A paper describes a structure:
Aurora A is a serine/threonine protein kinase that plays an important role in controlling early stages of mitosis, including centrosome maturation and separation, mitotic entry, and bipolar spindle formation. Localization and enzymatic activity of Aurora A are regulated by its interaction with the spindle assembly factor TPX2. The initial fragment hits identified from screening with the ATP site blocked by a high-affinity inhibitor were very weakly active, but guided by continuous crystallographic analysis of the inhibitors in complex with Aurora A, we were able to increase target affinity by more than 10,000-fold, clearly demonstrating the ability of fragment-based and structural biology approaches to develop potent PPI inhibitors when a suitable binding pocket is present. These compounds occupy a hydrophobic pocket on the surface of Aurora A, discrete from its ATP-binding catalytic site, which forms the interaction surface for a linear N-terminal segment of the interacting peptide from TPX2.
Through a further iterative development of the inhibitors utilizing the crystal structure-guided drug design and biophysics (FP and ITC), we improved the affinity of our weak, millimolar fragments by over 10,000-fold to generate the lead compound CAM2602. In addition, the meta-channel between Tyr199 and His201 could be further exploited by the replacement of nitrile with heteroaryl ether, to give compounds 9, 10, and the lead compound CAM2602. CAM2602 engages with the Tyr pocket through hydrophobic interactions at the bottom of the pocket and with polar interactions further outside. The indole NH hydrogen bonds with the Glu170 side chain, and the acyl sulfonamide stacks against His201 and Lys166. The pyridine ring in the meta position pushes Tyr199 sideways, creating a channel between His201 and Tyr199 and forming a T-stacked aromatic interaction with the latter. Finally, Arg179 latches on to the central aromatic ring, with CAM2602 bound to a well-defined pocket which is partly induced by the binding of the inhibitor. An overlay of the crystal structures of early hit 2 with CAM2602 bound to Aurora A reveals a remarkable overlap of the core biaryl scaffold in the two compounds. CAM2602 displaces TPX2 from Aurora A with a KD of 19 nM and a ligand efficiency of 0.33. Our lead compound, CAM2602, inhibits Aurora A:TPX2 interaction, binding Aurora A with 19 nM affinity. CAM2602 exhibits oral bioavailability, causes pharmacodynamic biomarker modulation, and arrests the growth of tumor xenografts.
Residue numbers in the entry: 127 to 388
The structure:
């Protein structure tokens, strides 16, 4: 049982859809953590209060060094608070802005961590569905940590999400409003692997219009510097038909992953 009086609030770590994430310290233990704050009014208007308990319940029951931890949760008159593990090295998103693109070693490494964390999520039939650089956080040793379980659900699901932010990571099945499996996360893995190497996602467009078309048609191209091995893994992953998409063990054992991964 927790309350806001139990914490000292620091600076904002980042901005959320329904609030903001703050750096904080628990007074009793001196424990540093991140407090994800969600406004009740905003959540009510979206009718997503049910999905919040779902994000809460799913994340709370996951233990993995490559998965952001959820210590607890509490609420008051106006807000719902999520006591998260603090990731000191920020988002993968911020890293990509800095470096423009990652090398094959860095990419394969992040992909390995994603795949481990993902395979483990899928073992509980848990699908993330919001895999993207802003939701991939970095630990003290620079280890990839999956976060933002806001749109997570148990597999299979037919649930429709509050439209995009960027439609860029969603598979055609989710976009078409069709039923989806753990395959959604595999598609996202292909999008992420491409973005890390190229600096931008494979179906990126100026409009939601063009993006939907491109995702639907699976219409993307590789720049010349992309290695043949990277092309194979990405190509294997971006299958329109979910069944075609490989398992995580195949991904984890891919020669390119094994050659440049750590
Ligand atoms: C209006 C309201 C309440 C609320 O007032 N609850 S209560 O006081 O009346 N009533 C006793 C459950 C509660 C929530 C809510 C929705 C989801 C979560 Cl996870 C939440 O946080 C916790 C944490 C620990 C135990 C239970 N819930 C709170 C939301 C989300 C949007 N509007 C809300
Ligand atoms: N544990 C954390 N450590 C560090 N930064 C965090 C942490 N959790 C969130 N952030 C920052 O706050 C942003 C929003 O948090 P997130 O859980 O992804 O919210 P939302 O569901 O609103 O998108 C993140 O993308 C990141 O920039
Ligand atoms: O944690 C949140 O801000 C939200 C809870 C309700 C579902 C959507 C979710 C999100 O945008 O990640
Ligand atoms: Mg997010
Ligand atoms: Mg979210």
């Amino acid at each position: 049982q927790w309350a806001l009086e139990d914490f000292e609030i620091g600076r904002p770590l980042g901005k959320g859809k329904f609030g903001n994430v703050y750096l904080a310290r628990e007074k009793q233990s001196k424990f540093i953590l991140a407090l994800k704050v969600l406004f009740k009014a905003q959540l009510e208007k979206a009718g997503v209060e049910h999905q919040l308990r779902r994000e809460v319940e799913i994340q709370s029951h996951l233990r993995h060094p490559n998965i952001l931890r959820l210590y607890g949760y509490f609420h008051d008159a106006t807000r719902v608070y999520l006591i998260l593990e603090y990731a000191p090295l920020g988002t993968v998103y911020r890293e990509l802005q800095k470096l423009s693109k990652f090398d094959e070693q860095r990419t394969a490494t992040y992909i390995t961590e994603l795949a481990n964390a993902l395979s483990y999520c899928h073992s509980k039939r848990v699908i993330h569905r919001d895999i993207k650089p802003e939701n991939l956080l970095l630990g003290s040793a620079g280890e990839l940590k999956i976060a933002d379980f806001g749109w997570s659900v148990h597999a299979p699901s037919s649930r429709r999400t509050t439209l995009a932010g960027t439609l860029d990571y969603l598979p055609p099945e989710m976009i078409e409003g069709r039923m989806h499996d753990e395959k959604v996360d595999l598609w996202s893995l292909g999008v992420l692997c491409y973005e890390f190497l190229v600096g931008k996602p494979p179906f990126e467009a100026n409009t939601y219009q063009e993006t939907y078309k491109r995702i639907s048609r699976v219409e993307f191209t590789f720049p010349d510097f992309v290695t043949e091995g990277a092309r194979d893994l990405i190509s294997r992953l971006l299958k329109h038909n979910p069944s075609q998409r490989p398992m995580l063990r195949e991904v984890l054992e891919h020669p390119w992953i094994t050659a440049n991964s750590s």
